[PDB]
Amino acid sequence: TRTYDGDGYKKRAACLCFRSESEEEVLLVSSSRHPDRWIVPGGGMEPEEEPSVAAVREVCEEAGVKGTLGRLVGIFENQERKHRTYVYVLIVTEVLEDWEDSVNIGRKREWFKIEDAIKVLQYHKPVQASYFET
Ligand SMILES: O=P(O)(O)O[C@H]1[C@@H](OP(=O)(O)O)[C@H](OP(=O)(O)O)[C@@H](OP(=O)(O)OP(=O)(O)O)[C@H](OP(=O)(O)O)[C@H]1OP(=O)(O)O
Ligand SMILES: [Cl-]
Numbered sequence: 297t298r299t300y301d302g303d304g305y306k307k308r309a310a311c312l313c314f315r316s317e318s319e320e321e322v323l324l325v326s327s328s329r330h331p332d333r334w335i336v337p338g339g340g341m342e343p344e345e346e347p348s349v350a351a352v353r354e355v356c357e358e359a360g361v362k363g364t365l366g367r368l369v370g371i372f373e374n375q376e377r378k379h380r381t382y383v384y385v386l387i388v389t390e391v392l393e394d395w396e397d398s399v400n401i402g403r404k405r406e407w408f409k410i411e412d413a414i415k416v417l418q419y420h421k422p423v424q425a426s427y428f429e430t
């Protein structure tokens with residue numbers, strides 16, 4: 297069930313899934329519709345679901361990782377697609393071999409240096425590139 301803010305923006309949560317507390321390498325996943333493109337894992341908040349809980353759930357489903365939830369980075373809008381995403385830091389401590397989206401849609405995952413994550417997100421996902429600005 298999709299959920300919405302009072303202005304009709306779809307509510308989403310996502311994590312920047314870092315390898316370590318150094319925050320030098322981040323895990324991106326393939327686009328579901330265009331698997332040659334990379335995205336930051338994330339998705340819709342469920343009814344009454346805390347954003348931090350949604351963020352951790354979506355990372356598990358899409359990227360097959362678990363770890364230590366860190367700070368809220370910020371709340372980011374995509375004006376064209378009308379969605380508003382809470383973005384958290386997650387320090388990955390568990391990498392699972394088989395995960396929901398690998399089994400169901402063959403979703404891929406890959407580690408990127410921050411500068412390279414920004415580069416591959418810029419063309420189709422410039423708001424997700426902007427998650428790393430600070
Ligand atoms: O363009 P499309 O129809 O292929 O899908 C878009 C996006 O559509 P939009 O731009 O109209 O919002 C989906 O949102 P909706 O239309 O379902 O509300 C979104 O689901 P999401 O918010 O993450 O929600 P969850 O399913 O994770 O909860 C999905 O991400 P994937 O999860 O990776 O499939 C995106 O694909 P892409 O980013 O290319 O992978
Ligand atoms: Cl790191």
Ligand SMILES: [Cl-]
Pocket residue numbers: 374421423424
């Ligand atoms: Cl976006």
Ligand SMILES: [Mg+2]
Pocket residue numbers: 337338339340358
């Ligand atoms: Mg998603």
Ligand SMILES: [Mg+2]
Pocket residue numbers: 338339340354357358
């Ligand atoms: Mg999802």
Ligand SMILES: [Mg+2]
Pocket residue numbers: 339340354
């Ligand atoms: Mg979802």
